[PDB]
Amino acid sequence: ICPGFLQVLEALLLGSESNYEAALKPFNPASDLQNAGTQLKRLVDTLPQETRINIVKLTEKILTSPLC
Amino acid sequence: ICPGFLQVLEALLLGSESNYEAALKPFNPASDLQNAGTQLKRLVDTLPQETRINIVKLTEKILTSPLC
Ligand SMILES: CS(=O)(=O)c1cc(Cl)c(-c2cc(Cl)c(S(C)(=O)=O)cc2Cl)cc1Cl
């Protein structure tokens, strides 16, 4: 799952549209499910710039939190 | 990283607030980084109900996509 998911990590924060949904193509998200992923991208293109590098530089401290 | 991250998966979609930030406590997200995680929760409490079970039932089809 690590590999199949980054194309969405960028299409989500480092993307704007077309790459996020097209990135979900290989995942063939259910109907509504995909719908939620589309808006998921909007919320990303609706925040400032620091909030962008933040959730991107934040999801790492929450998931891949270095240190112990 | 699989384990340390679900407390946020629920605090994010199955949560509203306090559990999401408090869930990031153990991850000690940087300053702004955490800021982005706070709004991250708002965007979740700002969508309908199907969009909620969707991104939750969607992030699985994108990441843990069954089948091949
Ligand atoms: C399935 S999806 O593509 O619609 C999706 C939706 C969300 Cl909310 C996140 C997400 C997940 C988390 Cl945990 C955070 S955070 C690092 O702010 O908690 C931010 C975001 Cl945008 C990630 C993805 Cl890939």
Short mmCIF file of C-alpha atoms in Angstrom, two decimals, chain A residues 1 4-5 8 20 24 27-30 32-37 39-40 43 47 50-51 53-55 57-58 61-65, chain B residues 1 4-5 8 20 24 27-30 32-37 39-40 43 47 50-51 53-55 57-58 61-65:
data_model
loop_
_atom_site.label_atom_id
_atom_site.label_comp_id
_atom_site.label_asym_id
_atom_site.label_seq_id
_atom_site.Cartn_x
_atom_site.Cartn_y
_atom_site.Cartn_z
CA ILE A 1 0.00 0.00 0.00
CA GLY A 4 0.22 2.49 -4.55
CA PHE A 5 -0.85 5.70 -2.77
CA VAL A 8 -2.31 10.45 -4.71
CA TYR A 20 -5.71 13.27 -8.38
CA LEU A 24 -7.30 7.15 -8.48
CA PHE A 27 -7.42 2.33 -7.58
CA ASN A 28 -10.85 2.39 -9.27
CA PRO A 29 -12.49 3.97 -6.22
CA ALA A 30 -16.21 3.14 -5.90
CA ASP A 32 -19.42 8.07 -4.27
CA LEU A 33 -16.07 7.04 -2.75
CA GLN A 34 -14.34 8.66 -5.73
CA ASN A 35 -16.70 11.65 -5.37
CA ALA A 36 -15.27 12.26 -1.89
CA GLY A 37 -11.74 12.04 -3.34
CA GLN A 39 -13.56 17.26 -3.15
CA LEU A 40 -10.59 15.96 -1.16
CA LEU A 43 -9.94 21.30 0.10
CA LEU A 47 -5.94 26.50 1.71
CA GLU A 50 1.96 27.05 4.23
CA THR A 51 -1.11 24.93 5.05
CA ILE A 53 3.40 22.27 2.73
CA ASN A 54 2.08 21.82 6.24
CA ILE A 55 -0.36 18.90 5.76
CA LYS A 57 5.11 18.20 5.90
CA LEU A 58 2.62 17.27 8.65
CA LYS A 61 5.32 13.90 11.47
CA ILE A 62 2.03 12.14 12.26
CA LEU A 63 2.72 8.96 10.27
CA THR A 64 6.49 8.73 9.66
CA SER A 65 7.34 10.61 12.87
CA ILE B 1 3.77 3.85 10.49
CA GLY B 4 0.90 5.15 14.61
CA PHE B 5 -1.55 6.92 12.26
CA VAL B 8 -5.69 10.13 13.29
CA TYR B 20 -7.54 14.77 16.11
CA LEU B 24 -1.29 14.27 16.97
CA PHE B 27 3.34 12.67 16.80
CA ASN B 28 4.28 16.15 18.09
CA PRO B 29 3.70 17.74 14.68
CA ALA B 30 5.79 20.89 14.09
CA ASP B 32 2.46 25.24 11.40
CA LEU B 33 2.43 21.55 10.42
CA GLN B 34 0.01 20.92 13.29
CA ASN B 35 -1.93 24.04 12.23
CA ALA B 36 -2.62 22.38 8.88
CA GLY B 37 -3.78 19.24 10.70
CA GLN B 39 -8.00 22.61 9.54
CA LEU B 40 -7.61 19.11 8.10
CA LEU B 43 -12.68 20.06 6.12
CA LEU B 47 -18.73 17.78 4.18
CA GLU B 50 -21.69 10.20 2.45
CA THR B 51 -18.58 12.26 1.65
CA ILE B 53 -17.89 7.53 4.81
CA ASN B 54 -16.63 8.09 1.29
CA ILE B 55 -13.13 9.48 1.93
CA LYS B 57 -14.34 4.13 2.49
CA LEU B 58 -12.33 5.73 -0.35
CA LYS B 61 -9.81 1.69 -2.32
CA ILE B 62 -6.95 4.07 -3.17
CA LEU B 63 -4.43 2.68 -0.67
CA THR B 64 -5.58 -0.81 0.36
CA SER B 65 -7.28 -1.48 -2.99
#
